[PDB]
């Protein structure tokens, strides 16, 4: 029947915003996943490089967008809504420099994005932005930071999180992968986090996607200390890390 989900600013009898609820299903319907995990003095984002459901140049299609030279982020969901969200973030992070001098913090960037998102929720101005992403980046405290935001307002932040269509089949796997490094050996920190976290990150993606995970269909980025650049790891290093599973 004609239920109460027509507009976006109208509550339901039980009290649920169904326009927001349907917008989260838009991200789960794009069948594009991504994993983000923060370890010691580093954090990485693993993309998937797939068309949001011939002759397409695969180097152009991606799900990683640097907001600044220090704060990078990923995007999923509808390709139209995710592109405009980066521009509503690049024009915001750069605005922080012109209005406050310092570079924007990773935790302040996500909370400032959610403030604009919440405004479009209470008002019937525009449609919701069917997207999600993992904002990555280190701060002035020399600590890595990761933050995930849903189509609604959220500044959760996780040490390891999965965004995409498989969030209901990955917490049972990421908890074990995180446990495979925290309560395990944990010897020292020889600044070899890439061989310690990213190796224990790509392994998490292989446990989610049952494919062989071709190196020409995956691209990661690191924002660790001594680098501080959100550099996209080259193809040769990606294929080299894929053979480390043996």
């Amino acid at each position: 029947q004609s239920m109460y989900d027509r507009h976006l600013t109208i509550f339901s009898p039980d009290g649920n915003l169904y326009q927001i609820e349907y917008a989260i299903k838009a991200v789960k319907n794009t069948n594009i996943t991504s994993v983000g995990v923060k370890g010691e003095n580093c954090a990485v984002i693993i993309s998937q490089k797939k068309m949001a459901t011939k002759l397409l140049d695969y180097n152009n299609i991606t799900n990683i967008y640097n907001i600044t030279d220090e704060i990078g982020c990923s995007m999923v969901g509808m390709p139209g809504d995710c592109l405009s969200m980066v521009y509503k973030a690049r024009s915001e992070a750069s605005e922080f420099l012109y209005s406050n001098g310092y570079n924007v913090n990773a935790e302040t960037l996500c909370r400032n994005i959610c403030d604009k998102i919440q405004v479009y929720t209470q008002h019937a101005y525009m449609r919701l932005h069917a997207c999600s992403g993992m904002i990555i980046g280190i701060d002035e405290n020399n600590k890595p930071e990761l933050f995930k935001f849903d189509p609604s307002g959220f500044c959760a932040g996780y040490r390891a999180c999965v965004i995409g269509n498989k969030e209901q089949e990955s917490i049972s796997v990421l908890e074990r992968l995180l446990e495979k490094r925290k309560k395990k050996i944990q010897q020292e920190t020889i600044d070899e986090d890439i061989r310690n976290t990213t190796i224990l990150a790509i392994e998490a993606l292989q446990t989610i996607l049952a494919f062989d995970l071709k190196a020409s269909e995956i691209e990661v980025a690191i924002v660790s200390t001594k680098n501080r650049n959100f550099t996209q790891i080259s193809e040769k290093e990606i294929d080299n890390y894929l053979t480390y599973i043996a």
């Binding site: 239920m3 976006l8 326009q19 349907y22 011939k54 397409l56 139209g80 809504d81 592109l83 525009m126």
Partner: protein, 233 residues
């Protein structure tokens, strides 16, 4: 239960209806085509609207537009709504030329045009655009690149792409010959052979190529090179 009315209404399945109908709107209009070559980027545009007018001029209905001397733009869909995007494209070049005194690059124009089309989708009162845009260029050092902008953003780099009423037909004809390293002067004769497969011997297909080492700038159709069409092989 009728949820595809406005553009701000999300379907319960998760899809975004009222914007997917636009793909069914561009699938009934005339087609456009473009492809990469080792000497330039030859374009194409078939206007399959011969059975009703037959009174228009031969070289009047042109659907090839350029923002400046080195970036071409075509339409596929509502010809009226595409005029508004060209106005936003040329103004984007002119605004970029004032603030930076140089030609606007391709990877920064496509990202600004796709934002303009996507911006009208979010509104509850403005209707979305109904025109798919093909943006291409050909650098002197680097090779060409064709960006395809469909409704609801999604800027994608291509190497050959067709959009219109036979997108599932001409796509199979391009993957046969590797057009990445052939020429422009021979591909133009091959393009006219494809149109004859899928519907008469008429000169209603106007198209230009951006580069034939002709100062690497957007030329015209050059009728003398178009008239020796291999109409049989």
């Amino acid at each position: 239960a009728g949820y595809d009315l406005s553009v701000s209404t999300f379907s319960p399945d998760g899809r975004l209806y009222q914007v997917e109908y636009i793909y069914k709107s561009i699938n009934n209009n005339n087609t456009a085509l473009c492809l990469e070559c080792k000497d330039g980027i030859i374009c194409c545009c078939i206007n399959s609207n011969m059975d009703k007018n037959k009174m228009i001029k031969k070289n009047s209905y042109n659907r090839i537009y350029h923002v400046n001397n080195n970036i071409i733009i075509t339409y596929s869909g509502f010809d009226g709504d595409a005029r508004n995007i060209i106005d936003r494209a040329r103004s984007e070049a002119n605004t970029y030329y004032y603030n930076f005194h140089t030609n606007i690059p391709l990877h920064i124009l496509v990202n600004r045009i796709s934002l303009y089309i996507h911006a009208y989708t979010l509104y509850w009162h403005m209707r979305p655009f109904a025109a798919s845009i093909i943006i291409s260029s050909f650098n002197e050092k680097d090779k060409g690149d064709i960006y395809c902008i469909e409704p609801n953003g999604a800027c994608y780099k291509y190497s050959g792409i067709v959009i219109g009423k036979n997108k599932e037909m001409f796509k199979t004809e391009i993957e046969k010959k590797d057009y990445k390293d052939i020429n422009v002067r021979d591909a133009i004769e091959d393009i006219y052979k494809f149109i004859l497969t899928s519907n008469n011997l008429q000169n209603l297909v106007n198209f230009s190529w951006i580069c034939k080492e002709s100062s690497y700038e957007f030329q015209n159709i050059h009728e003398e090179i178009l008239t020796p069409a291999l109409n049989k092989a």
